[PDB]
Design a protein around this nucleic acid. Structure first.
Length: 112
DNA sequence: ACAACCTCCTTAGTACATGCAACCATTATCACCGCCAGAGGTAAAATAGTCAACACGCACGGTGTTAGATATTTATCCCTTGCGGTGATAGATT
């Protein structure tokens, strides 16, 4: 209850058309349960930082592989999104259309 | 005591029919990297084998000659033309 607002200010970032303007807040409100259970204030650190790690990634996963058509081990989910993040160079440095042939040097790896 | 009635309140339930043409994108979001699985790698030997050696041995294809077929040439024959003589049709009657 004391943290229900911090769940909005983190979650609402990700609700940006992502799947809906709403639902990620309520999944953050369940990530907050694991956070409240493992709240090691006995290290010294603050619940702001706790939320910035754990509750943020509960908010991320709430529509990463949850609510999709498809779901995989998570390294192989967000790696598809590493490529979309890298494409921000491609679309302006090769800079007319995207080319997997450029992505091969930007990943140092074979396409297949 | 209730009853519906005066007024504009808002709510929200629908919006006819047949057909053809077009192509299928946008998001970001640390997945972290730690562990170890059976599990990737590969050495040495099972399930068994390569292809080079020297033999083996054969088929196929091209060069040569032969064969006979075919398309020409020739000339014959028939079926056809066009006109003509005169046909019994068309059909009205018996």
């Amino acid at each position: 209850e004391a943290n229900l607002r911090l769940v909005i200010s983190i979650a609402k970032k990700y609700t940006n058309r992502g799947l809906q303007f709403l639902d990620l807040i309520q999944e953050g409100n369940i990530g907050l349960m694991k956070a409240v259970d493992k709240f090691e204030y006995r290290r010294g650190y603050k619940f702001s930082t706790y939320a910035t790690w754990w509750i943020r990634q509960a908010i991320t996963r709430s529509i990463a592989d949850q609510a999709r058509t498809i779901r995989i081990p998570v390294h192989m989910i967000e790696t598809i999104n590493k490529l979309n993040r890298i494409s921000r160079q491609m679309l302006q440095e090769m800079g007319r259309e995207p080319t997997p042939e450029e992505l091969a040097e930007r990943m140092l790896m074979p396409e297949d």
